[PDB]
Amino acid sequence: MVDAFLGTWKLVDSKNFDDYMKSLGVGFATRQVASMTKPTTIIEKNGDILTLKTHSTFKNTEISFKLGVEFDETTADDRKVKSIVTLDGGKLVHLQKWDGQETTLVRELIDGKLILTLTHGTAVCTRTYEKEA
Ligand SMILES: CCCCCCCCCCCCCCCCCC(=O)O
């Protein structure tokens, strides 16, 4: 079940985000500001429809999806992708596909913290979120 993921979460640690963003071709100036941004992520559910909000002073996104059903997405860096999110080994696994490329955004609860692992190419970023509410 998804239920321990639900709520409001704040970024408290980030490792290799610049490498991940550079791998996606994000420009230097956007990486600069993103490296100093601390987002809030809000995860809500209504039945098997999940809504994932990511808020900040820089960029803001919102997606809604049905678990295990593909959806179109336009990412914070303006990639137009085909996406699917599923529970897999108790993790929320978000797979984005575009132009034959793939990136995964994997969320796992470890000791009450939500660990977001971002993989594109060889770049692996780990971001740790702490529960606000
Ligand atoms: C909405 C805020 C996202 C994080 C700061 C802006 C970064 C914009 C350029 C890179 C976007 C890459 C895809 C989205 C990464 C999501 C990271 C996260 O939720 O912590």
UniProtKB/Swiss-Prot annotation:
Binding of hexadecanoate, residues: R127, T128, Y129
Phosphothreonine modified-residue sites: T8, T30
Entry's Gene Ontology molecular function annotations: cytoskeletal protein binding; icosatetraenoic acid binding; long-chain fatty acid binding; long-chain fatty acid transmembrane transporter activity; oleic acid binding
Residues engaged in binding octadecanoate: R127, T128, Y129
CDD domains in the cross-refs: FABP3
Cell compartment(s), UniProt: Cytoplasm
PROSITE patterns hit by this protein: FABP
Any Pfam family matching the protein: Lipocalin
Matching InterPro entries: Calycin, Fatty_acid-bd, ILBP, Lipocln_cytosolic_FA-bd_dom
Modification Phosphoserine occurs at: S23, S83
Highest taxon, organism lineage: Eukaryota
Keywords: Acetylation, Cytoplasm, Lipid-binding, Phosphoprotein, Transport
Modified residues (N-acetylvaline): V2
Binding-site positions, (9Z)-octadecenoate: R127, T128, Y129
Residues carrying Phosphotyrosine: Y20
A single Gene Ontology CC term: sarcoplasm
One GO BP: cholesterol homeostasis
UniProt family annotation: Belongs to the calycin superfamily. Fatty-acid binding protein (FABP) family.
Protein function: FABPs are thought to play a role in the intracellular transport of long-chain fatty acids and their acyl-CoA esters.
UniProt xrefs under PANTHER family: FATTY ACID BINDING PROTEIN
Written domain comment of the UniProt record: Forms a beta-barrel structure that accommodates the hydrophobic ligand in its interior.
Protein name: Fatty acid-binding protein, heart
Organism the protein comes from: Homo sapiens
Highest classification ranks of the organism: Eukaryota, Metazoa, Chordata, Craniata, Vertebrata
